[PDB]
Design a protein around this ligand. Structure first.
Ligand SMILES: C[As](C)(=O)[O-]
Ligand SMILES: C[As](C)(=O)[O-]
Lengths: 195, 193
């Protein structure tokens, strides 16, 4: 009957998706059935898609994730054999917010700021940026921000000194990966009113 | 420092929104954008910083309404926020329907049902049921019968004239504005269900 689709080819295309194409098999295929799954998963966790043309876009995938996939053809007699297996990884996406900020009071003018890695890295985190400045009683910034680039992603703690005694400050931490910077995690803190 | 004016959002690509505005009056050093899923507390808002009067909101939910606003910050701190703008993300194909449920009626008849996809990712307008004979290896061995369901609310179908004691593969998939999603499958033989 129908032969196996030939030259299966895949490539990341856009956000959370993969363009998977192949060469129609000898004979008269009426369509194609694609099976794909996260690399490492049992085919029991595979997803099934149909297509009338020799290509298909796999969507709603996880970012920076490895996928495996194969395709077979079907016609009047039934389904033919599956093509060989191809693998492909999805593009990165900016990380989510870092974990909630934690503060240790070293003195009336110094604090240690720490944070957990974002719940969703969506890639490989290469840095963090800490920003902070004075805010009024309504928590509104009233002066320029101070920014510190953290080059070592494992160093999720920063000592901040020379802070104005008994004044509230707004602190934020944002993370970067291959796709760029993500949203910021925020906290309003006054070292004088901390436990 | 004034408030950025003429803010406007536009769905741009998958799970994304292009939000832009006009630089305010004064000397803005950058901008803070606040956005959240419409209907949720601003307490659930996400915060982005940008040096240019434009930003790409990503990792959003498909077919979801979002509200947003932006402010500029400078030597004296933050200026007031812009007016609020709303925008809805594009649709994505639905996930697969719920696991297929069969209630055998006769040796040649069965009722088939399924739940709505966990992730509709849009407004489902139809489902397609497909079924046919399979061999020992669960490989389709013949023609595939197809029933189009135009009313998304009718997620139950009565199937008749099935060959006695023969295994069949059943699949159901959903369609919304973005197209057809993946299919939910099941191989069943009424003689041994
Ligand atoms: C370092 As300062 C601008 O709080 O004097
Ligand atoms: C309705 As038949 C093709 O199983 O005889």
């Amino acid at each position: 009957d129908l032969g196996a689709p030939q030259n299966p080819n895949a490539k990341a295309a856009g956000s959370r998706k993969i363009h998977f194409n192949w060469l129609p098999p000898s004979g008269k295929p009426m369509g194609y059935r694609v099976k794909y799954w996260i690399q490492g998963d049992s085919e029991s966790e595979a997803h099934l898609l149909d297509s009338k043309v020799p290509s298909v876009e796999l969507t709603n995938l996880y970012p920076y994730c490895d996928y495996e996939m194969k395709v077979c053809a079907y016609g009047a007699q039934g389904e033919g054999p599956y093509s060989s297996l191809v693998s492909c990884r999805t593009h990165q996406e900016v990380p989510s917010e870092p974990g909630r900020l934690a503060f240790n009071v070293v003195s009336s003018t110094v604090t240690q700021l720490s944070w957990a890695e974002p719940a969703e890295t969506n890639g490989e985190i290469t840095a963090y940026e800490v920003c902070y400045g004075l805010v009024n009683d309504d928590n509104r910034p009233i002066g320029p921000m101070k920014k510190v680039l953290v080059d070592n992603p494992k160093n999720r703690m920063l000592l901040i000194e020379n802070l104005r005694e008994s004044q509230p400050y707004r602190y934020t931490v944002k993370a970067r990966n291959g796709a760029g910077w993500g949203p910021e995690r925020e906290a309003i803190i006054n070292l004088a009113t901390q436990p």
